[PDB]
Swiss-Prot record, chains A, B:
One Pfam family of this chain: Lipocalin
Entry remark concerning the domains of this protein: The molecule consist primarily of eight antiparallel beta-pleated strands, which enclose a hydrophobic pocket, and an alpha-helix.
Protein name: Insecticyanin-A
Location relative to the cell: Secreted
GN (gene name): INSA
Length: 189, 189
């Protein structure tokens, strides 16, 4: 199950001076906090492409030999347009269902790692769930960068319980797929 | 039991431009979050006296006809001296045991109400307990002021669960006492 904690989401401020073009690229999910929709995928990678005017997203993972993917639009969050903070929206369409995902970027050096997060409040439960992802431009978080990440993460110890991260897998095996499948699309729901 | 929530205490900033002389006086505890040491006392009042150089505290409550009290020193918290925020220390001595209590003042209008709080982190439990007190210069929080308090409290909804407050009692009966007893003192532990 996803991780929930009592009460409203805590105050949090994402990264300043966010640079979307610098952020663009293929991000590997080295690890994440449990997230129902993606708990079973492996070799999880999110690829963001930028035009200067337009941004798009290509997300994929592999489940039992199948490569599932999603294609959508990406844009800076309306409020972040004014503050210049790292907050973006990913819009995906499943038939008539439209989804607007909003990851918050707590920190990143743009070339090697990113620490993303979200807080989802359930009023009916008076509790919130927390989601987080350790992202890297390499399939492995390597030694220098590993230390960098760990120290940064530490400054967010009151927002993310590091001990709850779950490592993803990028072995050739894990990433292997015999076939594909688009989760997004007009003939979806 | 006291109220605990998981993780480290959240970020919080107490009232700005704190004025100790204006704060001085007798504060009635209209309500509080459960706090073991004082759960049984009634007619609970904290009285702070200021010289301009020196501040002292006189705390009291009544348990079964007995008026228990504590006498100590009061001073602005070392860090608050620089920031001018509302944070103070109460030092009490029980024999050789010395206690340094630190309430944080979230908000106050000085003449009628104050909203005090604290967060105690237990590393061995990876959780923190939260304490809070609604204080008033009158034995009753009256109508205008009640509305004022409620609206202020609302801005702290992510830090204090209002529904957990417990009302104190200031009836003549409650405050009645046949005898006294000093909890503080040299012949204490
Ligand atoms: C790794 C970077 C990454 C990521 C990756 C990701 N998710 C994926 C999968 C999915 N995302 C989804 O949203 C759904 C469900 C789609 C549906 O509604 O049917 C799936 C299966 C895939 C590959 C397919 C990939 C690469 N997904 C996010 C962000 C998110 N993924 C989320 O589900 C949410 C909302 C969380 C919440 O409910 O509160 C956010 C912010 C980030 C930051
Ligand atoms: C109402 C204002 C008020 C108050 C009142 C108060 N407490 C009292 C009682 C006590 N306070 C104490 O600390 C102890 C235990 C003393 C001991 O260590 O033996 C007792 C019995 C009395 C009357 C006696 C009164 C008026 N006490 C506080 C503040 C506090 N009371 C606390 O116990 C703590 C630490 C909480 C924690 O453990 O994390 C704080 C900040 C405020 C802001």
């Amino acid at each position: 199950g996803d991780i929930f904690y009592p009460g409203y989401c805590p105050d949090v401020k994402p990264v300043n001076d966010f640079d979307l073009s610098a952020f663009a690229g293929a991000w590997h999910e080295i690890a994440k906090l449990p997230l129902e929709n993606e708990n079973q995928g492996k070799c999880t990678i999110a690829e963001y492409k930028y035009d200067g005017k337009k941004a798009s997203v290509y997300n994929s993972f592999v489940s039992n030999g199948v490569k599932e993917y999603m294609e959508g639009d990406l844009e800076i969050a309306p409020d972040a347009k004014y503050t210049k903070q790292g907050k973006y929206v990913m819009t995906f369409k499943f038939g008539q269902r439209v989804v607007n995902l909003v990851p918050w970027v707590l920190a990143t050096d743009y070339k090697n790692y990113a620490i993303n997060y979200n807080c989802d409040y359930h009023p009916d439960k008076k509790a919130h769930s927390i989601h987080a992802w350790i992202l890297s431009k390499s399939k492995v978080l390597e030694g220098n960068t590993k230390e960098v990440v760990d120290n940064v993460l530490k400054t967010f110890s009151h927002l993310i319980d590091a001990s709850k991260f779950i490592s993803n897998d990028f072995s050739e095996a894990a990433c292997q797929y015999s076939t594909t499948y688009s989760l997004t699309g007009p003939d979806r729901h």
